[PDB]
């Protein structure tokens, strides 16, 4: 019932999440590779991210919005598959802002696996 909104596309290296939300807080729908039905390691493939983006795009288009600001987050692999899925869905993409957390040399990261 709202024309403009935000789409948070978080791409973890292990999984992906797409949350369609009102311009200020109050997420309106959400989807992820797990809710798609993919399980285990298949959740981290770009195709699963595209599937999740397509489902959420169809859902929110039937809900009836037009303009989307796409907030890209994380450092996965299928970071652009969701972008192309939304573009193919056809919602008016206005902004491509990226908001993956960057630190200013605070907090100690985990150990390096070997």
């Amino acid at each position: 019932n709202v024309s403009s909104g935000i789409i948070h596309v978080s791409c973890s290296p292990n999984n992906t999440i797409v949350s369609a939300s009102d311009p200020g807080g109050n997420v309106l729908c959400w989807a992820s590779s797990g809710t798609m039905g993919f399980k285990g390691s298949r959740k981290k493939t770009p195709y699963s991210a595209g599937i999740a983006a397509d489902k959420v795009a169809k859902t929110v288009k039937e809900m009836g919005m037009a303009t989307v600001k796409l907030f890209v987050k994380g450092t996965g692999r299928g970071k652009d598959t969701a972008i192309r899925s939304f573009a193919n869905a056809g919602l008016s993409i206005t902004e491509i802002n990226e908001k993956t957390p960057i630190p200013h040399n605070g907090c100690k990261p985990p150990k390096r696996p070997r």
Binding site: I96, E98, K99, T100
Partner: protein, 59 residues
């Protein structure tokens, strides 16, 4: 890192976003695993030397 689509075309927006995401992902992956201070300095100097040699050969 906001980039405006400009509503004139879409491929241009992705062409810039590719870069912005690349230099973002560099630091994002740097701040993922813990290395000692000396090893971090060594890695920084190695990256700087690689970039320096590439620019020397490209200029």
């Amino acid at each position: 890192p906001k980039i405006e689509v400009k509503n004139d075309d879409l491929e241009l927006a992705l062409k810039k976003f590719k870069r912005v995401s690349l230099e973002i992902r560099r630091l994002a992956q740097r701040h993922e695993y813990h290395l000692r201070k000396g090893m971090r300095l060594r890695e920084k100097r190695k990256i700087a030397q690689k970039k320096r040699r590439k620019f020397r050969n490209m200029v």
